[PDB]
Amino acid sequence: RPTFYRQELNKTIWEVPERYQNLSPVYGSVCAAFDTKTGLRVAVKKLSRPFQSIIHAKRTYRELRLLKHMKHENVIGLLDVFTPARSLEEFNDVYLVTHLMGADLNNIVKCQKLTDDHVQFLIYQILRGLKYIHSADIIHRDLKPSNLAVNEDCELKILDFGYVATRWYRAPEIMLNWMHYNQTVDIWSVGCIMAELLTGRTLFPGTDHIDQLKLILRLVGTPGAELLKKISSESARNYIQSLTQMPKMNFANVFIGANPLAVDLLEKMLVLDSDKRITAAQALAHAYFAQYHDPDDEPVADPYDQSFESRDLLIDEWKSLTYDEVISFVPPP
Numbered sequence: 001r002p003t004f005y006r007q008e009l010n011k012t013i014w015e016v017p018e019r020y021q022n023l024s025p026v027y028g029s030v031c032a033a034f035d036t037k038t039g040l041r042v043a044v045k046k047l048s049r050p051f052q053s054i055i056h057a058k059r060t061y062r063e064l065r066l067l068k069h070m071k072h073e074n075v076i077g078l079l080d081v082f083t084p085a086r087s088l089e090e091f092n093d094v095y096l097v098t099h100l101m102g103a104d105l106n107n108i109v110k111c112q113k114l115t116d117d118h119v120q121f122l123i124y125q126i127l128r129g130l131k132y133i134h135s136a137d138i139i140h141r142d143l144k145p146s147n148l149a150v151n152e153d154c155e156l157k158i159l160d161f162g163y164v165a166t167r168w169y170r171a172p173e174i175m176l177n178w179m180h181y182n183q184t185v186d187i188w189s190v191g192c193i194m195a196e197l198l199t200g201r202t203l204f205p206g207t208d209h210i211d212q213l214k215l216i217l218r219l220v221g222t223p224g225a226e227l228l229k230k231i232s233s234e235s236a237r238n239y240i241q242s243l244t245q246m247p248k249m250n251f252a253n254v255f256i257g258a259n260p261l262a263v264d265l266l267e268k269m270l271v272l273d274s275d276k277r278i279t280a281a282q283a284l285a286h287a288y289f290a291q292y293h294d295p296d297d298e299p300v301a302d303p304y305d306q307s308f309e310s311r312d313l314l315i316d317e318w319k320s321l322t323y324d325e326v327i328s329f330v331p332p333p
């Protein structure tokens with residue numbers, strides 16, 4: 001067992017192993033830190049009140065379970081997970097050790113203008129990380145530029161914190177009510193991000209969920225009868241058919257002189273019918289990614305157990321299960 005040191009950072013008390021040094025404030029309580037074991041700079045996240053309720057406790061276990069499973073170059077990873085607690089009995093705090101994100105995707109644009117090669121590389125990497133995530137039966141559901149970390153080498157990872165409104169990137173099926181989300185809600189978001197990288201502008205800068213859906217309809221059209229077949233709710237249907245028919249615009253016209261192959265892929269991503277949306281594994285083999293695509297270096301995830309999601313449990317049970325997950329952590333190479 002490591003040896004800890006306490007400090008006030010700030011009005012919060014931080015208890016971390018000596019391995020982590022020079023903590024400075026940077027989610028909900030993150031310090032940048034020097035990881036003296038690897039020589040690297042890390043994000044250390046201290047969770048506030050992880051076990052305060054059943055919902056908080058489930059949330060905490062869910063995040064720990066997910067971070068521990070994520071083992072991909074284009075996806076956030078868990079460098080370490082620690083508690084000062086010695087026993088289940090004194091177990092109250094959970095700290096997450098992640099690589100430090102400097103700039104997100106927006107910070108990267110609001111620095112410099114992007115080549116078509118940059119869009120290719122950036123969107124390649126989002127899709128390759130998403131391929132991995134989707135294959136674990138996980139759906140991100142909040143993909144947007146603030147959830148994507150990009151280094152000085154323009155290398156990218158997917159994360160989720162919890163600009164930059166989530167709605168601008170939301171699939172239309174989410175802003176009505178579903179549920180019965182499929183994975184390609186995440187492809188819509190990617191579509192929305194990719195257009196914005198090309199255009200330098202928010203594709204659907206809705207003022208709210210209504211104005212949002214108005215903007216979406218202009219570009220892609222109002223649904224046709226084959227999509228209207230699949231809509232269950234009575235209205236639901238008395239909004240879409242109660243709104244004047246719109247033609248599906250010509251993407252080539254809307255997307256300027258962007259690369260015509262980026263215009264093709266966009267078309268295939270921003271389909272109003274979630275069933276006809278290109279998947280991540282399909283998007284990787286698109287001609288826009290010819291310079292980056294390698295069928296043999298686009299890995300999938302190990303099987304991922306999320307049966308816990310159907311369980312309603314007590315705070316102490318969620319908390320014990322988180323404690324196990326903390327104890328069974330195997331630090332990566």
Ligand SMILES: CNC(=O)c1cc(Oc2ccc(NC(=O)Nc3ccc(Cl)c(C(F)(F)F)c3)cc2)ccn1
Nearest residue numbers: 026027030043045076098100101140158159160161
């Ligand atoms: C400017 N510096 C910082 O503020 C800072 C804070 C950091 O802390 C973080 C610590 C943990 C997480 N947890 C996730 O990301 N959770 C996640 C949930 C669902 C899903 Cl689906 C995924 C996914 F997609 F990856 F798989 C990831 C996010 C950020 C890291 C780096 N930098």
